[PDB]
Design a protein around this nucleic acid. Structure first.
Ligand code: MG
Ligand code: MG
Ligand code: MG
Ligand code: MG
Ligand code: MG
Ligand code: MG
Ligand code: MG
Length: 41
RNA sequence: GAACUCGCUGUGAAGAUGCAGUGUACCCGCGGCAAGACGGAAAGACCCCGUGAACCUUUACUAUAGCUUGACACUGAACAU
């Protein structure tokens, strides 16, 4: 899955970029706590 | 099935009231007995057959519920080997 980040998650990514992350990771953690949004543009 | 429904000996799907020979016997009831009518009942239960049935068994065949194994999915993160 592709996510547009909204924060600096000290694991892997910085703000405002599209990054390939596990679908479950994005669905359960990133999206539900801000941090990221899906890459729909 | 219909009967004007005797005994014997034989013959005969091979154990005869009914065929042959022969003996006996007037016609008809009533009370009894139960030897025969292969008496009545039940399309033999025993036996065999049917490429018949049913239930039952098992290390008969084929499956399958269940139990169980792993892959993939729901399912992600960090790190160390
Ligand atoms: Mg005789
Ligand atoms: Mg006689
Ligand atoms: Mg009498
Ligand atoms: Mg009798
Ligand atoms: Mg009597
Ligand atoms: Mg009889
Ligand atoms: Mg019969």
């Amino acid at each position: 899955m592709q996510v547009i980040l909204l924060d600096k998650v000290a694991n892997l990514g910085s703000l405002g970029d599209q990054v390939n992350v596990k679908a479950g990771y994005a669905r359960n953690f990133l999206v539900p706590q801000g941090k990221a949004v899906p890459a729909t543009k």
